[PDB]
Write an enzyme that holds these catalytic residues in place. Structure first.
Site, PDB file in Angstrom:
ATOM      1  N   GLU A 293       0.827  -1.204   0.000  1.00  0.00           N
ATOM      2  CA  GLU A 293       0.000   0.000   0.000  1.00  0.00           C
ATOM      3  C   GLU A 293       0.856   1.246   0.000  1.00  0.00           C
ATOM      4  OE1 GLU A 293      -2.960  -0.216   3.226  1.00  0.00           O
ATOM      5  OE2 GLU A 293      -4.047   0.799   1.541  1.00  0.00           O
ATOM      6  N   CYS A 327      -1.856   7.856   6.923  1.00  0.00           N
ATOM      7  CA  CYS A 327      -1.692   7.268   5.587  1.00  0.00           C
ATOM      8  C   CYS A 327      -2.096   8.274   4.577  1.00  0.00           C
ATOM      9  CB  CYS A 327      -2.579   6.074   5.374  1.00  0.00           C
ATOM     10  SG  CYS A 327      -2.477   4.828   6.599  1.00  0.00           S
TER      11      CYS A 327
HETATM   12  N1  NAD Z   1      -1.753   3.490   2.237  1.00  0.00           N
HETATM   13  C1  NAD Z   1      -1.544   3.284   3.537  1.00  0.00           C
HETATM   14  O1  NAD Z   1      -2.266   2.580   4.235  1.00  0.00           O
HETATM   15  C2  NAD Z   1      -0.351   3.910   4.190  1.00  0.00           C
HETATM   16  C3  NAD Z   1      -0.118   3.731   5.570  1.00  0.00           C
HETATM   17  C4  NAD Z   1       1.004   4.285   6.165  1.00  0.00           C
HETATM   18  C5  NAD Z   1       1.872   5.021   5.373  1.00  0.00           C
HETATM   19  N2  NAD Z   1       1.622   5.192   4.048  1.00  0.00           N
HETATM   20  C6  NAD Z   1       2.457   6.014   3.160  1.00  0.00           C
HETATM   21  O2  NAD Z   1       3.825   5.856   3.320  1.00  0.00           O
HETATM   22  C7  NAD Z   1       4.510   7.101   3.475  1.00  0.00           C
HETATM   23  C8  NAD Z   1       4.734   7.086   4.948  1.00  0.00           C
HETATM   24  O3  NAD Z   1       5.925   6.577   5.502  1.00  0.00           O
HETATM   25  P1  NAD Z   1       7.440   6.387   5.087  1.00  0.00           P
HETATM   26  O4  NAD Z   1       8.027   7.748   4.931  1.00  0.00           O
HETATM   27  O5  NAD Z   1       7.976   5.514   6.225  1.00  0.00           O
HETATM   28  O6  NAD Z   1       7.563   5.761   3.614  1.00  0.00           O
HETATM   29  P2  NAD Z   1       8.999   5.467   2.878  1.00  0.00           P
HETATM   30  O7  NAD Z   1       8.646   4.848   1.556  1.00  0.00           O
HETATM   31  O8  NAD Z   1       9.961   6.565   2.963  1.00  0.00           O
HETATM   32  O9  NAD Z   1       9.655   4.335   3.816  1.00  0.00           O
HETATM   33  C9  NAD Z   1       8.943   3.102   4.005  1.00  0.00           C
HETATM   34  C10 NAD Z   1       9.911   2.033   4.479  1.00  0.00           C
HETATM   35  O10 NAD Z   1      10.724   1.597   3.384  1.00  0.00           O
HETATM   36  C11 NAD Z   1      12.079   1.652   3.890  1.00  0.00           C
HETATM   37  N3  NAD Z   1      12.832   1.662   2.655  1.00  0.00           N
HETATM   38  C12 NAD Z   1      12.940   2.708   1.772  1.00  0.00           C
HETATM   39  N4  NAD Z   1      13.657   2.307   0.717  1.00  0.00           N
HETATM   40  C13 NAD Z   1      14.039   1.019   0.916  1.00  0.00           C
HETATM   41  C14 NAD Z   1      14.791   0.000   0.204  1.00  0.00           C
HETATM   42  N5  NAD Z   1      15.336   0.314  -0.987  1.00  0.00           N
HETATM   43  N6  NAD Z   1      14.920  -1.248   0.704  1.00  0.00           N
HETATM   44  C15 NAD Z   1      14.372  -1.538   1.895  1.00  0.00           C
HETATM   45  N7  NAD Z   1      13.678  -0.637   2.618  1.00  0.00           N
HETATM   46  C16 NAD Z   1      13.473   0.596   2.192  1.00  0.00           C
HETATM   47  C17 NAD Z   1      12.148   2.834   4.823  1.00  0.00           C
HETATM   48  O11 NAD Z   1      13.257   2.876   5.729  1.00  0.00           O
HETATM   49  C18 NAD Z   1      10.888   2.550   5.578  1.00  0.00           C
HETATM   50  O12 NAD Z   1      11.115   1.565   6.603  1.00  0.00           O
HETATM   51  C19 NAD Z   1       3.552   8.180   3.038  1.00  0.00           C
HETATM   52  O13 NAD Z   1       3.664   8.416   1.617  1.00  0.00           O
HETATM   53  C20 NAD Z   1       2.236   7.504   3.420  1.00  0.00           C
HETATM   54  O14 NAD Z   1       1.091   7.908   2.671  1.00  0.00           O
HETATM   55  C21 NAD Z   1       0.539   4.652   3.456  1.00  0.00           C
END
Ligand code: NAD
Ligand code: NAD
Lengths: 535, 535
Positions: A293, A327
């Site tokens: 998601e 989210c």
């Molecule tokens: N749709 C939903 O239900 C929902 C829920 C929560 C958050 N979100 C979304 O996510 C974002 C929120 O949080 P975020 O900043 O933690 O997202 P992000 O994509 O920056 O990070 C998500 C996770 O991926 C990790 N990550 C990033 N690149 C990686 C890689 N190459 N390999 C392994 N791990 C990697 C990060 O350290 C983190 O743990 C916002 O855009 C938000 O809308 C969506």
């Protein structure tokens, strides 16, 4: 065992208020002081072994008071990642061979531990590290995670009893196998519940997992790991690898035993992992289940029949709860002029007065933004808004990263019908243009996860549910479009996404299984010739 | 309408035997003569319009008598494909706005038409064009397609009533929306049932579709289209485009409105379409739902406790039914020496005598291979087997493409433990090596869709179900591993595939929807402040 057993019946965990004089408030303070005053190492947890690794040291701090360290982790190296993969593959056989009920007991027991003796600890750790008020920590870190565990156990048990018809002469059954390979769970900063569920959902169904939590959520994550261990989670079933995840992906996406990825976070990260797995598709023993998601931004439309008071409260809460860092947060409001006359001034005065500060002061409505990257994106959005002709900053806009990553609640007025932060754009439209505004919303929406209509008029409500049917994942009437509760408001992904299988229903769990039919025939044919062939 | 309606309760359609003197045999002959003596144009069916296009003319012939033409189609050109896409997008709004019950009535009515007045016609067309005996045509073209329609309508109705919990103060409901965009259904030669279901399943749920049937199945396909029209399918809901499909894909995979692909056929075709959609992922309005099944080959293991007679019949039928041209056919048998002593000679004598010829002679056990490409691959497999040291041709091996594409049932004996055709490899193993043979099977199997154990000994059966748990999709006891019946033996994809969502359960139908939650709150908060914040 000779039984057809049932699981306990799940119900949603009650939300504690932490009102002054309540015993939970006093327990929370003790936990807040204890975590804040005694920062810890935050190690990798691999095959049951807690170890700091050799990668760079990275501090986890209070976003609202960034001089105050909560712990220090190490950036997973390649060797750490390879160790997490081997430990998962090595726990698999004894975990998959435990009966469902014994697997389920782990998660039901974790739920009850989180509901009781660990409750204020996991809430306090989420408050401190993620900058959540006690309410935000409670609905997420406690109630939503508990409900994921109890509801998933109920959903899994429901899946196991979906069985086929047996014809005369035979017995057909279905066996819900785990996947062959490991599962890679990558989780976002903003929900301790999502961070817990992502790795434990596939685990419940017999899989083993490597879990890469967000750095700024790693305190609550490490403590979630400890809670699962106290619940009886066997070593190596879930393996926690800390850091930015880059070296974890280098190993995991290259391993042919990758069974699936369970991801929540940004669309940029999702795309990258998705393209990577597609590039490498020829190496995998099985087609990897990609369950993910990604974000969006939410809208509210208020009809001329909207209740002013409801609307104002839904905008404040929807936009400004958790500093707009859920989210999706309410980012765009479309308000009928006549309703704007009745609640516009009050919305602006209330946003002006809303208190963001240190979340250990339970006075505050909320905290800071999560890290310096989020703070910079919010500064830029505010300065773009100051310079754009189409928008006026009506209230807020001030920011100061000197003690914490603080951005004030901000309302923009837009005469024309990204980042994550407390910024609400309001367009005021003429009452008689309701239907035309619905069309604007429909035409311009690709990234709404939830929308809401505020209206007492039934015809206006049905017109919104009809016209905006495809313009939003979930859709709310007379409330804020945020805060899905498990078992009550499932689904809710962005437009065009493929998200029937997200956390919160049995469909997520089926993604972690491979079903097979077993047919037994009691008296099978002993001549091959068919009746048509006769002379 | 003020109702909560139920659909008729589905049960499997009875299989007619077409025994001598039966009235269905006489009706079938009339239909066989009528199709065979009056070949037709096989046009495209676009927005309800039957039209020959401008692409090359390609004859559809009787595989078992390839001088006898059944019809002639035209190879879809780009303009045809673009017309099918626009007609689907143009039927969508009036189809999606019909209530479920009226959509469902179309398919229930098609079922009853296929069960009754169209029965022997759709069976005859499948016999003639695909080279199926009357039994093979009946279990597929009639019974399995009827059961897909009735069962899908029941499964869909079951999905619609899966609804969430409402808390105090609110009402939560779920709306199962269709997809936004068109669905592209691509179907294989070998099942008239699969060819029908692939396009109609997503249609039932409110989608519109372009359908690209296999050339050699196009007679039964065109007649399936006519049947759906007589059932009330509105114009443009499903649009039939004939030919090799290359020009159809050029248009469809490039169109940003592609919502999904519903495919069954070879892994080479699947990979190509899959890589294409992935290459173009940035153009699509929504992430396209890829729902597909690809082939494999099946095995049988006979324990020392196997019944000789059952085993022999399961090998003959499993390998040689439909000339080995099902989704999977029995290709590898592992038979205990002591059981081989009791039924080896009889298996070889019966394979030697089995009659393949013109399927209008209802004497014959079966027909020919589907086309010259299949015939060449089978010739090559046979010649490779003649030249390999590890295999002896024990019976069969003869082939002659002069009147039809005929390959004799062939049994290979292999001392060591691709194509689609009537070739069975038998390895005879020492009785006491049962467990070691199970390990060989497990280690060497990536492409078994179904396996079977033949054994009366319960311990031997449970040992096979345990050890081969992951070495095969479905798993059969004391029967042939082919012929899944709808509602009875769901699933059954290859190892590591992601096929929980294949035809035959409600999960396939959910792939053609996007679920949304609607929450109404009756008395929402009118103050934003939370109880924790109080003095
Ligand atoms: N749709 C939903 O239900 C929902 C829920 C929560 C958050 N979100 C979304 O996510 C974002 C929120 O949080 P975020 O900043 O933690 O997202 P992000 O994509 O920056 O990070 C998500 C996770 O991926 C990790 N990550 C990033 N690149 C990686 C890689 N190459 N390999 C392994 N791990 C990697 C990060 O350290 C983190 O743990 C916002 O855009 C938000 O809308 C969506
Ligand atoms: N797993 C199952 O349930 C199942 C069932 C039936 C058949 N099969 C498998 O499928 C194969 C059987 O049939 P087949 O020979 O018809 O498979 P195939 O892949 O040759 O053809 C399948 C369909 O794709 C079409 N096609 C091929 N390339 C295309 C393109 N680029 N664009 C559009 N259409 C295209 C063909 O004309 C045909 O209609 C075997 O390998 C068999 O195992 C599997």
């Amino acid at each position: 065992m000779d039984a057809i057993t049932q699981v306990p019946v799940p119900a949603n965990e009650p939300v504690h208020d932490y009102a002054p004089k309540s015993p939970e408030r006093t327990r929370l303070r003790t936990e807040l002081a204890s975590l804040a005053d005694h920062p810890i190492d935050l190690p990798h947890v691999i095959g049951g072994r807690h170890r700091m690794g050799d990668g760079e040291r990275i501090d986890v701090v209070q976003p609202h008071r960034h001089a105050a360290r909560l712990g220090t982790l190490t950036n997973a190296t390649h060797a750490d990642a390879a160790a997490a993969v081997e430990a998962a593959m090595s726990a698999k056989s004894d975990w998959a061979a435990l009966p469902f009920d014994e697997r389920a007991a782990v998660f039901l027991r974790a739920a009850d531990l989180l509901a009781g003796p660990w409750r204020e600890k996991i809430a306090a750790a989420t408050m401190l590290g993620q900058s959540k008020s006690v309410y935000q920590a409670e609905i997420d870190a406690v109630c939503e995670l508990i409900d994921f565990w109890r509801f998933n156990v109920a959903f899994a048990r429901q899946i196991l009893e979906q069985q086929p018809i047996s014809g005369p002469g035979e017995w057909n059954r279905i066996d819900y196998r785990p996947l062959d390979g490991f599962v890679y769970a990558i989780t976002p900063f903003n929900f301790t519940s999502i961070a817990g569920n992502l790795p434990t959902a596939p685990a419940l169904m017999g899989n083993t997992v490597i879990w890469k939590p967000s750095i700024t959520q790693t305190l609550a994550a490490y403590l979630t790991m400890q809670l699962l261990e106290a619940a009886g989670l066997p070593p190596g079933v879930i393996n926690l690898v800390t850091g930015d995840g880059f070296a974890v992906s280098d190993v995991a996406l290259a391993d042919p035993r990758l069974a699936g990825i369970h991801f929540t976070g940004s669309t940029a990260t999702f795309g990258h992992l998705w393209q990577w797995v597609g590039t490498n598709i020829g190496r995998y023993h099985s087609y990897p289940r990609l369950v993910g998601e990604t974000g969006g931004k939410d809208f509210v439309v208020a009809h001329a029949s909207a209740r002013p008071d409801v609307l104002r409260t839904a905008l404040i809460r929807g936009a400004f709860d958790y500093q707009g860092q859920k989210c999706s947060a309410v980012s765009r409001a479309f308000i009928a002029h006549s309703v704007w006359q009745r609640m516009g001034d009050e919305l602006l005065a209330k946003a002006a007065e809303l208190r963001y500060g240190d979340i250990t002061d339970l006075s505050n409505y909320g905290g800071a933004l999560i890290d310096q990257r989020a703070f910079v994106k919010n500064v830029d959005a505010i300065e773009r808004a100051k310079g754009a002709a189409a928008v006026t900053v009506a209230v807020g806009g001030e920011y100061d990263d000197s003690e914490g990553y603080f951005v004030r609640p901000t309302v923009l007025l837009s005469d024309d019908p990204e980042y994550f932060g407390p910024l609400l754009s309001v367009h005021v439209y003429p009452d008689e243009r309701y239907e035309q505004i619905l069309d604007v919303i429909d035409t311009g929406s690709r990234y709404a996860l939830t929308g809401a209509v505020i209206a007492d008029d039934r015809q206006a409500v049905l017109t919104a549910l009809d016209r905006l049917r495809f313009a939003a994942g979930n859709f709310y009437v007379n409330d804020k479009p945020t805060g899905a509760v498990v078992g009550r408001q499932p689904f809710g992904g962005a437009r065009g996404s493929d998200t029937n299988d997200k956390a919160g229903s049995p469909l997520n769990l089926l993604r972690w299984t491979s079903a097979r039919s077993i047919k037994e025939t009691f008296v099978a044919a002993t001549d091959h010739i068919y009746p048509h062939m006769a002379v």
